[PDB]
Each structure stands twice: as structure tokens, then as C-alpha cells.
Amino acid sequence: TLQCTNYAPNLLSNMRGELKQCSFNMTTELRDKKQKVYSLFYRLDVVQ
Amino acid sequence: DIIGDIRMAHCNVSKATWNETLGKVVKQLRKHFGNNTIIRFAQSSGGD
Amino acid sequence: QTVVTQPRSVSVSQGQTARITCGGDNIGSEAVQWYQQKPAQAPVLVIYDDSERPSGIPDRFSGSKSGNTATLTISGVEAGDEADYYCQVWDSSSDHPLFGGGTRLTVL
Amino acid sequence: EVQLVETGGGLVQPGGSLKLSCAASGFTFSSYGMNWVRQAPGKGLEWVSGINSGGGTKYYADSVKGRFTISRDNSKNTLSLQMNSLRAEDTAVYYCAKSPWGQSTSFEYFEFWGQGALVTVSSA
Ligand SMILES: *[C@@H]1O[C@H](CO)[C@@H](O[C@@H]2O[C@H](CO)[C@@H](O[C@@H]3O[C@H](CO)[C@@H](O)[C@H](O[C@H]4O[C@H](CO)[C@@H](O)[C@H](O)[C@@H]4O[C@H]4O[C@H](CO)[C@@H](O)[C@H](O)[C@@H]4O[C@H]4O[C@H](CO)[C@@H](O)[C@H](O)[C@@H]4O)[C@@H]3O)[C@H](O)[C@H]2NC(C)=O)[C@H](O)[C@H]1NC(C)=O
Ligand SMILES: *[C@@H]1O[C@H](CO)[C@@H](O[C@@H]2O[C@H](CO)[C@@H](O[C@@H]3O[C@H](CO)[C@@H](O)[C@H](O)[C@@H]3O)[C@H](O)[C@H]2NC(C)=O)[C@H](O)[C@H]1NC(C)=O
Ligand SMILES: *[C@@H]1O[C@H](CO)[C@@H](O[C@@H]2O[C@H](CO)[C@@H](O)[C@H](O)[C@H]2NC(C)=O)[C@H](O)[C@H]1NC(C)=O
Ligand SMILES: *[C@@H]1O[C@H](CO)[C@@H](O)[C@H](O)[C@H]1NC(C)=O
Ligand SMILES: *[C@@H]1O[C@H](CO)[C@@H](O)[C@H](O)[C@H]1NC(C)=O
């Protein structure tokens, strides 16, 4: 489960609300430590 | 992250050629649906 | 509009702990920095995204976001860490960066 | 060694203009969205005048809105801010910033600061 926000004002109105920067936890090499990462995903990959 | 400024991803088809190609197809479909009929195209309906 | 209040110039003296609290309206939208700055100097980032710190800062600084009022908990003192501290919690509905107030820290 | 060098004028009467310049002989400056903040010798901070890494958005605050501009010329590492109205004095110092995302907002911070903050005063 991962948290996301929209982008800029981006007032072009073609790309408004499209790119969805997200952040989540993800397991590293060692088993009992955690790694925090930032990425983004197009609008047809996430569902609230 | 995205460096620069964002647009859409788009495709171009030359309008003078694509008019001629639909003109050649619609002369051929008259042999299968009667000569006196006024052929109309449309968009896709729906689904996935 | 939307206020981010924090106490005016709290000062403990050699207790080796200090809790510069913060808060206001809807936190749960990334209470995000604290931004230590010394007089006639440049501001320096100290803690980003309220859990980690950049490389090059000693681990006397520690933040936590609790409920609706986040806070910064420093544990330990120094004769060169008397400075000013303030939140940067906002980005919504309007101009996205919005600093809030100030807080002076002195030890005796 | 990543730093910011600055030029800035002062003592401009409240009917003229002023142009500030922040330059960067450090990092790869074609990708990061630089910003501006202000500070009177007084209350605290106040935000103005953001930009992306292409010069295509350039959004502003609610107290300087529709009154100033931001130029950004790449390939020679130069930001150009141009204050042009100069109303009755909110005498404040100005800082050059850097945000390690590029392109946008929605949780943004500031790594390295430039601390070149010469003041607009408009005295006699
Ligand atoms: C498919 O169909 C579409 C629509 O029919 C076709 O779209 C056309 O695409 C043209 C080029 O993409 C576009 O022209 C653009 O017009 C604008 C406004 O007039 C102009 O600013 C653009 O300028 C670029 O090219 C000129 C050429 O004279 C350069 O002098 C100029 O520096 C610009 O180059 C940019 O890209 C370079 C890439 O390396 C950069 O190095 C360069 O510095 C610059 O990038 C930055 O500089 C700008 C100024 O600081 C800044 O704004 C920019 O965002 C970067 O930060 C260009 O001439 C047509 O307008 C467009 N037609 C429309 C929209 O109707 C498309 O070509 C067709 N074909 C394909 C295959 O898609
Ligand atoms: C990634 O991993 C971290 C690991 O810490 C997760 O942070 C933890 O999230 C839980 C869920 O909110 C926190 O529990 C909370 O405790 C407070 C205590 O009052 C309670 O009021 C809340 O209702 C909730 O139960 C937990 O404290 C927190 N850990 C720390 C150290 O703050 C995080 O949620 C994971 N996911 C993401 C997307 O970051
Ligand atoms: C699709 O792209 C091709 C090449 O990417 C275009 O073909 C060239 O178009 C230019 C137009 O200025 C001509 O001068 C060239 O002779 C064409 N051929 C080559 C090999 O470069 C084509 O025109 C594009 N189609 C559309 C509709 O723009
Ligand atoms: C397309 O071609 C036909 C015949 O070649 C012509 O009548 C028509 O004006 C052209 N343009 C459009 C937009 O249909
Ligand atoms: C329609 O056209 C074809 C050839 O173009 C022709 O043979 C046919 O007789 C036409 N239809 C009628 C009803 O005349």
C-alpha cells in the first residue's frame, strides 16, 4: 500500500493529473531492514 | 524523474494521403452492400 | 487562510532534551522540514520527510509526526547549536511552499 | 563543492525596477527547479516565485501575483529574477534555492542555499 500525490499547477490541461508521484517501503538485501524509495507511475497503473 | 517539460506522446498521419486511402476503400465496399448507400464511419464503442 | 502555529522561543538549559512542537490544521499532508539557521549564516536542511536526515548531520536530531501535531526532538546540547527552527509543512490548494513563524532556542 | 554565486543591487527608489542574478558553477544545472524566498529583518520567511526545469510553468505567490517575472536561461548556468513594480517597501533579503526533484511540486524541499541576500531599501 503506497501513498501518492498529483503534480504541479501544470495548467496546459492535457497532462493535468497524469503522472502520480508515489512513495513506499521495499525490502533491502538484509532481511530485517527496510528501504524507502520514491518513484512515479502513469495514471492507468494505480487504483485507490 | 522527468527532465525538461512534459507534453503528450502523439502520432502523425498525413491528411492528404489518409483521405485518398479511405476514398479507395469505400469504393470497394459498394460491391458488398449495394451501390446506393451512404457509408458512415464512427468511433469505438466501449470495453477494456 | 491556513495557519501553522508554533511556540515563540522556547528555551531549556542543559537538560539535554528539547521538544520544539509544531502543528495546526491538517497534518497528514507531509510535515516535512525544520530548517536550522544560525545568525548571519545560510539556512541548512536538517531533517527531510520527518524520518531521515541527509548525509553529514550528527544523530542528535530526530523527528516524529504524531496525530495532528508533529514535533522535532533534539537530545543533547552544544555551545554552537543555539539557533532558529521553523516548519515548512504545507503544500495544498494555493502556493505550495508555506513556512510558518519562528522559534528561538537558547541554552544557559 | 556545490555552491551558488550571486549579484544583486540595492537602494532603488519605489518607482523603478531591479534585476537579480543567481549563478551556479556547481552541479549539473539543467534538471533542478530553483526557487526564491524572502526575509525581512523581522518576522520570518515568506515564499515567492517558483519555476520548473524548463521555464514552462512559473507559478507565483498570492502577494506578488501578476506583478513580476522570472527568467531562466540554461546552457550558461544563469537564473534571472526581475522585480519591476517596487511598491512601498517590504524591505527584505532574498535567497537563492535548489530543489532536488525538478519539474514540479507536492512535496518539495531545499538542499543547498546561496546566502547572497542584498536588500531593497528605497531610502532618501
Ligand atoms: C507531428 O505533428 C506535430 C503537430 O503538427 C508536430 O509538432 C511541431 O513540433 C515542432 C518541433 O517539436 C514545433 O516547433 C516548435 O515551436 C516552438 C514555438 O514556436 C519553438 O519554441 C520550438 O523551438 C525549438 O526548435 C527551434 C528550431 O528553430 C530551436 O531554435 C529552439 O531552441 C527549440 O529547441 C528546443 O529543443 C532542443 C532539443 O535539444 C533544445 O536544445 C533547445 O534548447 C530547445 O529546448 C529548450 O528551449 C526553449 C527555449 O528556452 C524552451 O521553450 C524549451 O521548452 C526547452 O526548454 C519549436 O520550433 C511545432 O510548433 C509543432 N507544431 C504544432 C505544435 O502545431 C511534429 O513535429 C510532427 N512530427 C513528429 C515526428 O512528431
Ligand atoms: C513504511 O514503514 C514505516 C515504518 O515505521 C511505516 O511507519 C509506521 O506507520 C504506522 C501506520 O500509521 C504507524 O503507526 C501509527 O502509530 C500512531 C501512534 O500514535 C497511531 O496513532 C496511528 O494510528 C498508527 O497506528 C507507525 O508509528 C509508523 N512508524 C513510525 C516509526 O513512525 C509506514 O507507514 C510505512 N509505509 C509508508 C507508505 O511509509
Ligand atoms: C514521418 O517522418 C518521416 C521521417 O521521419 C518524414 O519523411 C521525411 O519528411 C520530410 C519533410 O520535411 C522530407 O523532406 C523527407 O524527404 C522525408 N523523408 C526522409 C527519408 O527524411 C515524413 O514526412 C513524416 N510524415 C509526416 C506526416 O510528417
Ligand atoms: C477528401 O477527398 C475527397 C475526394 O478525393 C474530396 O471530395 C474531399 O474534399 C477531401 N477532403 C475531405 C476533408 O473529405
Ligand atoms: C453499382 O456500380 C457497379 C459498378 O460500379 C454497377 O455494375 C452496378 O450496376 C451499380 N448499381 C446499380 C444499381 O446500377
The backbone region for D109, taken as left when phi is positive above 0, alpha when psi lies in -120 to 50, beta otherwise, is beta
Report how far ligand 4's centroid is from the alpha carbon of B27 (Å).
Answer: 13
User: Could you tell me how far CA C86 lies from the centroid of its own chain?
Assistant: 5
- Contacts (Cβ under 8 Å, ≥6 apart) of C3: C24, C25, C100
Question: Measured between CB atoms, which of B1, B2, B5 is closest to D56?
Answer: B5
CB count in 10 Å sphere of residue C75: 13
- All three cell numbers of D65: 501575483
- All three cell numbers of C72: 522535532
CA nearest D90: which of D116, D57, D64, D109? Answer: D64
D30 neighbors D53 (Cβ within 8 angstroms):
yes
A12 neighbors D60 (Cβ within 8 angstroms):
no
What chain D residue is nearest to C30 in terms of C-alpha separation? D107
Technique behind this structure? cryo-EM
Tell me the C-alpha to C-alpha distance, in Å, between residue A39 and each of A9, A19, A26, C30, D94. Answer: 20, 10, 12, 17, 32
H-assigned helices in chain C: none
What residue owns the CA closest to ligand 2's atom 21? C67
Query: What's this structure's resolution in Å?
Result: 3.9
C20 neighbors C10 (Cβ within 8 angstroms):
yes
Tell me the C-alpha to C-alpha distance, in Å, between residue A13 and each of A9, A10, A17, C103. Answer: 10, 7, 9, 41
Given CB atoms, is B6 within the 8 Å cutoff of chain D? Answer: yes
Residue A45: what are its φ and ψ, rounded to 5°?
Answer: -125, -15
In angstroms, the first-to-last Cα distance of chain A is 10
- All three cell numbers of C63: 523527528
**How far apart, in whole angstroms, are the C-alpha atoms of residue B4 and residue A38?**
19
Domain count for chain D, please give it.
Answer: 1
Report how far ligand 1's centroid is from the alpha carbon of B6 (Å).
Answer: 12
Q: Which domain holds residue C2?
A: 1-108
Tell me the residue type at D66. G
D window 16-45, beta carbon within 8 A of B: 30-31
Contacts 24+ apart (CB under 8 A), A8-17: A8/D52, A8/D57, A8/D59, A8/D103, A8/D104, A8/D105, A8/D106, A9/D57, A9/D59, A10/B6, A10/D57, A10/D104, A11/D57, A12/B6, A12/B7, A14/B7, A14/B8, A15/B6, A15/B7, A15/B8, A17/A43
Domain count for chain C, please give it.
Answer: 1
